Design an enzyme around this catalytic site. Structure first.
Site, PDB file in Angstrom:
ATOM      1  N   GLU H 702     -22.980  -0.683   5.636  1.00 42.92           N
ATOM      2  CA  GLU H 702     -22.794  -0.589   7.086  1.00 42.92           C
ATOM      3  C   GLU H 702     -21.313  -0.748   7.406  1.00 42.92           C
ATOM      4  OE1 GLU H 702     -25.387  -3.065   9.324  1.00 42.92           O
ATOM      5  OE2 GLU H 702     -27.188  -2.496   8.207  1.00 42.92           O
ATOM      6  N   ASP H 703     -20.616   0.377   7.566  1.00 37.15           N
ATOM      7  CA  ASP H 703     -19.232   0.458   8.026  1.00 37.15           C
ATOM      8  C   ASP H 703     -18.234  -0.134   7.040  1.00 37.15           C
ATOM      9  OD1 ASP H 703     -20.207   1.578  10.396  1.00 37.15           O
ATOM     10  OD2 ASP H 703     -20.293  -0.374  11.401  1.00 37.15           O
ATOM     11  N   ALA H 704     -18.680  -0.675   5.909  1.00 40.37           N
ATOM     12  CA  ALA H 704     -17.757  -1.241   4.941  1.00 40.37           C
ATOM     13  C   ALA H 704     -17.175  -0.139   4.058  1.00 40.37           C
ATOM     14  CB  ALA H 704     -18.455  -2.298   4.086  1.00 40.37           C
TER      15      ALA H 704
END
Ligand SMILES: Nc1nc2c(ncn2[C@@H]2O[C@H](COP(=O)(O)OP(=O)(O)OP(=O)(O)O)[C@@H](O)[C@H]2O)c(=O)[nH]1
Ligand SMILES: Nc1ncnc2c1ncn2[C@@H]1O[C@H](COP(=O)(O)OP(=O)(O)OP(=O)(O)O)C[C@H]1O
Ligand SMILES: [Mg+2]
Ligand SMILES: [Zn+2]
Lengths: 422, 149, 99, 298, 50, 54, 125, 739
Positions: H702-704
């Site tokens: 997630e968005d990393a």
RNA sequence: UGCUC
């Protein structure tokens, strides 16, 4: 769209310039007029024009209530006092119309009387709006107050002699502060008293049906010939525009209009400082055709040099003696020397190498880049080329200037060879 | 309102038909299409918007209101109820959005942002009240839910 | 999120670094996709950014092509070192004896 | 779910009109148990759900109709013998809307519940003609009190419930049969149920206070449960019915629908510390100190 | 959470009874479902469904 | 309806005189007897038939 | 009543009928002239400074244009606000310092407005 | 500092005391001078802004004034007597940084790319944000809490500001003012303002049947009472007047006088009365009542979020008001000291020179700029957050914070009404740039190409309006206001008059403005729904340049652009040659603008210069923003204000409490034209990395993102954090010092 | 106040 017909003439009359007033009734439609209403009087003042018309109204007509008339007459006035009565009889017979001033100056307004083939204009001395004033009610209220006072006094049948001697209540004429004095002057009561200080003037009324109306109606005309050239009213459109609209009172700060207002020398200097490269024909076109070519040439010869038929602003013009390089901070003299060397290289050859100039002038890359971008463009596989093409027309037209610039460039070349040891 | 509904219906027809065409023409193994099929992230609507055509920008469940006098932007005629002049976006994100379409999309985005901003505080207060009111009840051993008293 | 602008920026940057140019991402304009695709195919790279890549762990090629390209990443001031916090007993406030 | 709810719009429930508050505001109005809510909805079933004529008839029976809405022109006629306001009723529009109204019914509606005019001042001069004769009542009202009646007379009700503001004929298009029902945007359930032709046995409402006052506390509990479930389903999110049942019971365990606001919370709870911590700290604390109410630790 | 800079809190109980209650009642394996409707919240996510 | 006195311009009330109803002003003895019928229609918008939405 | 126009107004005032009419026109603040020997400055030049005689002409071109040629410049005449209330043009002449005469000259019905043709003045120079 | 200060000084040029007359203190001329430091003993010295940043002092210039007074009835004159210290804005006319070359900037330890325009006080950099407020002297028709559609007008003059409302709560119009005990009918006010006939009042309100039908109730309510003359109405108003808590001084039957004064001066201050002539005010209230009646039908309620009625106050107006207030306070203090000293001190004649405290104005300005809370008792203005600390996170951060705009709402709750993005923000403010969070929608940024107008003299405007046939409102009755072809022409909220065929008026006014005889910033708009011609000339209005289009062809051609590129002409030449003109929101509301040349049709009056100018400064960094979503652009603008990078060329000598620098910053490869305009490529705040879009190891769920160890080892992302630790060793009252 | 989420 030409003036096919109706070429009416305009005449001017000054007979009733100071005696012409415009009375308009905002509450009376134009259908019903006061021609049949018998007028009684008109109070007026020369200064601070405020006219008050006193007219008479019928009573025997069915549109008048006699009982309410008696009531209002008894309310406004006394029983049989009749020393100062708003109505002669016991009925409301007189009507008062008060005037309000629309504007102070009425010079721009004029009455136009139209006759067959002509229109006569007469200035207006004043314009007032007439409205039905309610002043009898104020006197009625004052009379009611005095009657209430009389009743309070007659509360007893026999009133003993009151020992109400007026003690001396003489107040100090205190020195009024300037602010309070201005407040008093600006008060409505002070203005009303000042208006009342002027004495009234009584005038009789002459209706439209009277012969005097048609008699004096002719003064709006003026005796004169049909065709007469007016001595005045002959200013050009530009003068009229200036009259009806009076005035209030980077290096490219000055605009084109502000530029043209400066002398020719300053114009040429600023144009060469802003552009730094421009032919002679372009300069003549920008400055205008009304300027002689010899003057422009003499002006540009002082703040520019000739390179391949084009004109390039001198170095000292762009870099004053007190200025310095915005990138390296070197003195302006070195920048001028470098720019002169660049211009000499351009005069000798159309293609100039940036590395050679940087090596000879010993200057940094940014200064040489700024010097070249002002008068050159980058051409791949060829280096830097002069932005404008070879202009041979100006060279053929002015050979003496060409020789002068050639000898000046020879001197500059001698100086550059002495300085840089070429 | 009838004209508004009909225009919205026509624009939605265009949108759904363009989306269906884009889904039918797309080939398998497409990462967006795969991620929309498996339901991991995204959906068919986002794919249609970013490939085929963006949908009608709806503010408060309606077309873009007339901010100026009788028109949304001065770039359109007065009393003009055309689709492109009320919020419709003919171009897709791939082809690029026009200035008016981008402005309408930003309007919708800020509307959603302010909606969420108000919702946060409103639901926070509602939750505080509901919990402070319902924190006393508990399930007893006799299968009867009783209050603190 | 439908951030096609990021893909367009990546493709334009790849084309620029290949041909040594600076493409413009001006709003409502800029370099189109066709120009950058032509620049990519002229230099011998794929016209869609996707390139054949081999897995570094297993050493075998991947079944799907990877989308490579230069992207302008900017680091933010938010660091874990400054945000990391742990509180022992520590001090307490005078009025109310709490941390 | 309140945070999960988006507070969407365009959810007209299939009628494309009658904007109703749904979402967090609706849950707030429900839990507050306010006597007056925004946009109250009343669903009424018809005995003859297949006939549209009967539907429109019962609508006109329940829907409030003003005198100005049925009269074609009102004119102040100042005859040389007397002055009076005259009203001409549009019998054509009356039979179009199927309203059981006539000149005599209008006269009876006048002089009643408004404007205090006496029966002797109103008369009927024809089939669809009514006359009103003001007088010098002397209560700061001279004959020119016409100017009051002329402004109030057009807004006098002739038929329908005063509380009912708007009623519409909704239709369900089930494949088996197309049925008709009444959607009333009013705040009077008793009057709607008492009207002729309305199946009062299957009439619901959105305002919990009216249901409580009309059909008892259990009806109010059921209405609260159904309304909360419907409002939650409108947003696509589901909640177990046990939670809403417990909420409704806690709101309806003292015989009266008490909201979650500070007032209902104080009426339900008894602990002084909790009431002081929630709201009105100083007021509740001083009240307890005055009453000397001992608070337990339960 | 979305791993976009969110700061989360971590607390350490100081009592064996509190430790046991946290492990039993607030256990991750014992709270795989929400009490709202019983749906499982702890399940696969992006990069796991694909 | 609204009518004004030509004399002063104030509103005219209607009052019963000694012979016939008449318009009269409250600030002057001006009156006007009514000879023929005078009417002022307003034509209210009626209720319309609304439809069977659904 | 339809809104009349100045061209048709003058046409029906002269062609359809021959009876004289009193008009009230509004001239600009400053006229395109100079006060003749009025002791000045580019100040305002009103009718009070001009003398009697012919001062200008009134032209009616095609398409309804009504212009006033008052010298080198040409103004345009348009219809002013349509006044419906009573306007009586009268002459109040104070012949004596104690008694004067008020002479009702006529009635005012129409109003005209004369304005400089700024477009022409700008495109000229 | 060059014009407004002189006007303020002239407004209070003479100050005198009541006691001991013939004594006065006359100001002749005030100067601000160049920035200096009072470090040396009774000697000044030029100081650079960087030195003030280092020494934790203020960058101000000494405010001096030449004066003449009377000590013992003998005129004594002073030619140079300092009175205060005004903080000098950087890159201003008197600032030492102006007219300097990059080399001279290096000599002064200042970045040439620094935007400037911010104050330096006690070492901290404060910026005065542009304030946004509603336009004054304007009628606003709005619905009340109960749904009643009423009107309001906030008349604000140079002295007093008064908001008067008008409601229809009971079918009749009641006027409400803060000086009246109870709202009174409008007909009584009409009768009190001179017009006593009801026919005239009705004609002024309107001649339409529905207008009279709606106004009938008010006439009837007025008839019920015995108010028929001006005296009775004034007496009623005075009865409805309350004293301002026992004003000092004998009343002496000022009830009617107080009523007339409130009607003339207090109520509708913006409408002037020549000499107790309420004709203009009567017409104004009549037009307001007509607007309310017309709005009582079709729901044409004006909206507050329409930026055409908004005004932007810069630091100039705020500083002018503050200086005026401080100068008035100083004059009052001096007059008090005089009154206290002269009458009882001694034969030694008193002089103000021995009591002219120079710290008053300096401390006032310092506290007003530092704390940011402005309390003006003369205007009763209590504002907070006017000044904010300039964010030095990066060059883009400061460049974007310099062009911020706050809302008058002063966010404290969820209004959700001004937070929306209105179409009126086209070309003026950046739609996408907005702080993401609680301040979303109320903290905005200016567009790339925009300008804020100043105040004009308004003389030639009135002269041209009068010469164009505008009939005087006092010459005709209000009935003409009800005609369909008669249009009202206003001027800054004041009724300028009436006109017919407003098309000619507007065309001639626009042509005269293009010619140059009228200021190019004077805006003219027309509203056909209300039939009103608005002429706006006040400052603070937002204007945008547009190319004039005539007959389907823009006035700007390729030849003009070539001349501009070669340097023959500049933008001022385009302005003078009727090629490009400034349009205001209210003006462009009636004009037709084209985005591109292909969009130009027959009905087009202007052409858009550039569409990408719609975005602001922070949004300009977004490469290909029209291909992304709006929340994405908002978050990108929010994070760009916090992006890490170089600040300037003097970042090494600069010492701030917190600074973030990048080891190897690189300019972007996909750079927008706005980046070249703002010269951000010279001070980049990021690095171009070879990113590969793919899933790897599942550590980027997630968005990393996954970073390369060797990349970070070779200097990628290496950053530097600079903190400041300051200590002070001060001398106390006693002869002891910190060692 | 600015922010972060
Ligand atoms: N820089 C800064 N400004 C603040 C702070 N608190 C408030 N302000 C400013 O002051 C205004 C609001 O003041 P409050 O926060 O109510 O001040 P307060 O809480 O009454 O003051 P204390 O009771 O002393 O904490 C806002 O407009 C802020 O800009 C703070 O902690 N730091
Ligand atoms: N005021 C707030 N109150 C509670 N939580 C907040 C607040 N502001 C931010 N958060 C936290 O941040 C998260 C909000 O993210 P969300 O709104 O779902 O995505 P987003 O910010 O719209 O990102 P995109 O714009 O969709 O890319 C959820 C919440 O836990
Ligand atoms: Mg997050
Ligand atoms: Zn009368």
């Amino acid at each position: 769209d030409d003036p096919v017909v109706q070429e009416i003439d305009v005449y001017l009359a000054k007979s009733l310039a100071e005696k012409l007033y415009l009375f308009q009734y905002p509450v009376r439609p134009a259908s019903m007029t006061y021609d049949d209403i018998p007028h009684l009087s008109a109070k007026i003042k020369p200064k601070q024009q405020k006219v008050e018309l006193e007219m008479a109204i019928d009573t025997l007509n069915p549109n008048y209530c006699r009982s309410k008339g008696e009531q209002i007459a008894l309310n406004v006035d006394g029983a049989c006092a009749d020393e100062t009565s708003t109505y002669s009889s016991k009925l409301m017979d007189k009507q008062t119309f008060c005037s309000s001033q629309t504007t102070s100056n009425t010079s721009r307004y004029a009455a136009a009387l139209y006759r067959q083939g002509e229109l006569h204009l007469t200035p207006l001395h004043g314009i007032l709006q007439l409205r039905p004033s309610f002043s009898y009610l104020d006197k009625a209220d004052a009379k009611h107050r005095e009657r209430e006072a009389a009743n309070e006094a007659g509360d007893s049948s026999q009133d003993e002699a009151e020992d109400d001697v007026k003690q001396i209540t003489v107040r100090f004429s205190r020195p009024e502060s300037e602010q309070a004095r201005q407040r008093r002057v600006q008060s409505y009561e002070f203005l009303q008293k000042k208006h009342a200080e002027e004495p009234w003037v009584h005038l009789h009324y002459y209706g439209l049906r009277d012969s005097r109306s048609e008699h004096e109606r002719q003064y709006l005309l003026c005796p004169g010939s049909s065709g007469v050239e007016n001595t005045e009213l002959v200013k050009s459109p530009s003068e009229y525009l200036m009259m009806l609209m009076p005035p209030s009172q980077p290096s490219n700060v000055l605009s084109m209009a502000q530029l043209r207002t400066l002398p020719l020398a300053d114009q040429i200097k600023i144009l060469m400082k802003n552009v730094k490269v421009m032919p002679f024909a372009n300069l003549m076109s920008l400055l205008g055709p009304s300027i002689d070519s010899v003057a422009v040439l003499r002006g540009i010869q002082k703040v520019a040099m000739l390179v391949q038929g084009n004109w390039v602003v001198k170095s000292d013009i762009l870099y004053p003696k007190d200025s310095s390089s915005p990138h390296s901070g070197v003195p302006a003299e070195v920048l001028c020397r470098g720019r002169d060397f660049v211009m000499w290289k351009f005069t000798q050859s159309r293609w100039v190498v940036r590395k050679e100039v940087a090596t000879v002038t010993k200057l940094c890359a940014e200064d040489v880049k700024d010097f070249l971008e002002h008068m050159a463009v980058v051409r791949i596989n060829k280096g830097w080329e002069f932005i404008l093409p070879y202009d041979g027309e100006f060279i053929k037209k002015h050979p003496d200037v060409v020789q002068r610039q050639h000898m000046l460039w020879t001197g500059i070349q001698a100086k550059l060879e002495k300085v840089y040891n070429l | 309102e009838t004209l508004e509904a009909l225009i919205l219906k026509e624009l939605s027809v265009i949108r759904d038909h363009a989306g269906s065409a884009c889904l039918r023409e797309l080939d398998k193994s497409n990462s967006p299409l795969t991620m929309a099929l498996c339901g991991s992230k995204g959906s068919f609507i986002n794919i249609s918007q970013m490939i085929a055509c963006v949908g009608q920008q709806a503010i408060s469940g309606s077309r873009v209101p007339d901010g100026f006098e009788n028109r949304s932007l001065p770039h359109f005629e007065k009393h003009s109820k055309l689709p492109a002049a009320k919020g419709f976006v003919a171009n897709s994100f791939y082809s690029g959005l026009t200035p008016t379409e981008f402005f309408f999309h930003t309007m919708a985005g800020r509307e959603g942002l302010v909606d969420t901003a108000v919702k946060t505080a409103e639901t926070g207060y509602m939750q505080r009240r509901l919990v402070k009111s319902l924190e006393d009840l508990c399930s007893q051993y006799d299968l009867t839910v009783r209050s603190s008293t | 999120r439908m951030t096609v602008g990021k893909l367009i920026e990546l493709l334009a940057g790849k084309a620029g670094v290949l041909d040594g140019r600076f493409h413009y991402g001006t709003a409502f304009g800029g370099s189109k996709v066709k120009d950058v695709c032509e620049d990519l195919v002229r230099h011998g790279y794929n016209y869609l950014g996707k390139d054949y890549v081999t897995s570094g762990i297993t050493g075998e090629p991947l079944e799907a092509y990877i989308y490579f390209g230069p992207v302008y990443y900017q680091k933010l001031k938010h660091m874990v070192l400054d945000k990391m916090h742990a509180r022992a007993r520590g001090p307490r406030a005078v009025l109310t004896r709490q941390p | 779910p309140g945070t999960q709810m988006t507070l969407k719009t365009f959810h007209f429930a299939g009628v494309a009109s009658m904007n109703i508050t749904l979402g967090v505001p609706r849950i707030k109005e429900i839990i507050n148990a306010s006597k007056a809510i925004s946009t109250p909805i009343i669903t009424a079933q018809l005995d003859k759900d297949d006939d549209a004529d009967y539907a429109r008839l019962v609508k006109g029976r329940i829907e409030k109709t003003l005198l100005g809405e049925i009269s074609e022109y009102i004119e102040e006629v100042f005859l040389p013998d007397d002055c009076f306001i005259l009203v001409k009723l549009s019998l054509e529009r009356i039979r179009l809307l199927r309203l059981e109204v006539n000149a005599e019914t209008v006269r009876y509606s006048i002089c009643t519940s408004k404007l205090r005019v006496k029966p002797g001042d109103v008369a009927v001069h024809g089939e669809a003609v009514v006359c009103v004769t003001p007088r010098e009542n002397s209560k700061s009202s001279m004959y020119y009190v016409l100017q009051f009646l002329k402004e109030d007379l057009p807004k006098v009700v002739v038929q329908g419930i005063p509380e009912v503001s708007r009623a519409v004929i909704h239709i369900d298009e089930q494949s088996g049969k197309e049925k008709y029902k009444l959607l009333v945007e009013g705040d009077n359930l008793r009057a709607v149920m008492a009207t002729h032709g309305v199946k009062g046995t299957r009439t619901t409402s959105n305002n919990t206070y009216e249901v409580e006052k009309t059909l008892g506390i259990e009806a109010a509990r059921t209405t609260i449960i159904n309304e909360i479930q419907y409002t939650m389903v409108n947003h696509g999110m589901s909640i177990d019915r046990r939670h809403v049942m417990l909420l409704s019971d806690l709101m309806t365990y003292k015989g009266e629908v008490l909201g979650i606001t500070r007032f209902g919370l104080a009426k339900m709870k008894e602990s002084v510390l909790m009431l002081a911590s929630f709201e009105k700290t100083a007021d509740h604390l001083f009240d307890a100190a005055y009453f000397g109410q001992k608070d337990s630790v339960c | 959470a979305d791993f976009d800079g969110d700061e989360m809190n971590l607390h350490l109980p100081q009592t064996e009874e509190a430790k046991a209650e946290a492990l039993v009642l607030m256990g991750t394996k014992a709270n795989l479902v929400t009490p709202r409707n019983g749906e499982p919240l702890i399940a696969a996510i992006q990069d796991f469904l694909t | 309806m609204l009518l004004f006195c030509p004399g002063c311009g104030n509103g005219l009330i209607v009052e019963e005189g000694q012979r016939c109803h008449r318009f009269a002003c409250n600030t002057c003895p001006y009156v006007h007897n009514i000879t023929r019928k005078v009417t002022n229609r307003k034509y209210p918008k009626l209720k319309e038939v609304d439809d069977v939405l659904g | 009543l339809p809104k009349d126009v100045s061209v048709a107004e003058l046409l029906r005032e002269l062609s359809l009928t021959k009876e004289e009419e009193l008009l009230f026109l509004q001239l600009p603040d400053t006229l395109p002239g100079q006060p003749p020997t009025q002791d000045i400055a580019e100040n305002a030049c009103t009718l009070a400074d001009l003398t009697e005689g012919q001062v200008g002409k009134l032209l009616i071109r095609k398409s309804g244009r009504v212009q006033l040629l008052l010298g080198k410049v040409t103004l345009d005449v348009t219809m002013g606000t349509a006044c419906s209330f009573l306007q009586e043009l009268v002459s109040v002449g104070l012949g004596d310092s104690r008694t004067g005469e008020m002479t009702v000259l006529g009635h005012v019905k129409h109003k005209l407005v004369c304005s400089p043709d700024f477009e022409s003045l700008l495109d000229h120079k | 500092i060059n014009v407004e200060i002189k006007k303020i000084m002239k407004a209070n040029e003479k100050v005198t005391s009541d006691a001991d007359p013939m004594w006065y203190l006359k100001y002749l001329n005030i100067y601000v001078g160049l920035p200096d430091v009072e470090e040396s003993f009774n000697v000044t010295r030029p100081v650079s802004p960087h030195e003030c940043r280092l020494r934790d002092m203020t960058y101000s210039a000494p405010i001096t004034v030449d004066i003449e007074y009377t000590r013992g009835s003998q005129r004594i004159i002073r030619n140079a007597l300092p009175i205060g210290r005004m903080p000098i804005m950087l890159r201003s006319s008197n600032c030492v940084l102006t007219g300097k070359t990059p080399a001279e900037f290096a000599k002064l330890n200042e970045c040439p790319l620094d935007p400037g325009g911010y104050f330096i006080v006690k070492g901290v950099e404060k910026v005065i944000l542009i304030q946004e407020q509603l336009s004054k002297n304007r009628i606003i028709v709005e619905a009340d809490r109960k749904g009643a559609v009423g009107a309001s007008v906030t008349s604000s003059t140079h002295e007093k500001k008064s908001r008067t409302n008008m409601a229809v709560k009971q079918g009749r119009f009641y006027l409400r003012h803060n000086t009246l005990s109870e709202d009174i009918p409008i007909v009584i006010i009409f009768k009190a303002m001179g017009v006593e006939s009801d026919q005239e009042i009705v004609q002024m309100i309107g001649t339409e049947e529905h207008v009279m039908a709606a106004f009938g109730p008010s006439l009837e309510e007025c008839q019920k009472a015995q108010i028929f003359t001006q005296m009775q109405a004034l007496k009623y108003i005075g009865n409805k007047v309350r004293r301002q808590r026992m004003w000092g001084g004998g009343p002496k039957k000022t009830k009617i006088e107080e009523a007339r004064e409130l009607l003339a001066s207090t109520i509708l201050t913006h409408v002037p009365v020549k000499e107790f002539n309420f004709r203009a005010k009567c017409i104004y209230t009549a037009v307001m009542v007509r607007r309310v009646i017309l709005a009582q039908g079709d729901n044409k309620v004006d909206d507050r979020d329409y930026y055409g009625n908004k005004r932007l106050e810069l630091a100039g107006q705020l500083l002018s008001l503050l200086f005026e207030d401080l100068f008035k306070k100083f004059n009052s203090e001096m007059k008090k000291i005089a009154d206290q000293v002269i009458p009882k001190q001694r034969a030694a004649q008193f002089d103000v020179v021995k009591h002219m405290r120079q710290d008053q104005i300096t401390n006032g300005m310092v506290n007003a700029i530092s704390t940011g809370n402005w309390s003006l008792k003369r205007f009763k203005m209590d504002r907070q957050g006017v000044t904010q600390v300039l964010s030095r996170l990066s060059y883009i951060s400061a460049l974007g914070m310099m062009t911020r705009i706050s809302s008058q709402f002063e966010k404290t709750r969820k209004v959700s009404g001004p937070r929306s993005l209105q179409p009126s923000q086209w070309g003026m403010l950046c739609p996408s740039d907005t702080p993401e969070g609680e301040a979303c929608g109320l903290v905005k940024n200016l567009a790339l190409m925009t300008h804020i107008t100043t105040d004009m003299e308004d003389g030639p405007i009135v002269k041209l309006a009068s010469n164009l046939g505008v009939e005087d409102v006092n010459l005709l009755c209000g009935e003409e206001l009800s005609y369909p072809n008669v249009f009202l022409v206003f001027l800054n909220g004041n009724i300028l008059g009436v006109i017919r065929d407003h098309k000619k008026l507007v065309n001639t006014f626009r042509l005269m403005r293009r010619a140059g005889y009228i200021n190019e910033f004077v805006s003219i708009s027309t509203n056909l729904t209300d039939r009103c011609v608005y002429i706006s000339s006040d400052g603070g209005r937002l204007c945008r340049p547009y190319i004039i289009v005539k007959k389907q062809k823009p006035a700007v051609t390729n030849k003009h652009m070539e001349e501009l590129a070669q340097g023959y002409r500049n933008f001022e030449d385009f302005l003078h040659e009727s090629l490009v003109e400034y349009l205001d929101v209210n003006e462009e509301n009636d004009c037709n603008i084209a985005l591109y040349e292909h969009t130009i049709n027959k009905d087009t009056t202007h052409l858009e210069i550039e569409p990408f100018t719609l975005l602001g400064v922070c949004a300009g960094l977004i490469p290909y923003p029209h291909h992304n979503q709006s929340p994405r652009n908002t978050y990108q603008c929010a994070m760009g204000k916090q992006a890490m990078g170089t600040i300037g060329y003097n970042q090494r000598n600069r010492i701030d409490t917190l600074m973030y620098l990048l080891a190897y910053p690189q300019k972007p490869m996909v750079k927008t034209k706005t980046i070249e305009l703002i010269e951000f490529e010279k001070l980049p705040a990021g690095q171009n990395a070879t990113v590969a879009v793919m899933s790897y190891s599942g550590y980027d769920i997630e968005d990393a993102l996954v970073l390369n160890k060797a990349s970070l080892d070779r200097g990628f992302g290496r950053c530097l954090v600079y903190k400041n630790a300051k200590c002070t060793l001060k001398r106390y009252t006693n002869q002891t010092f910190d060692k």
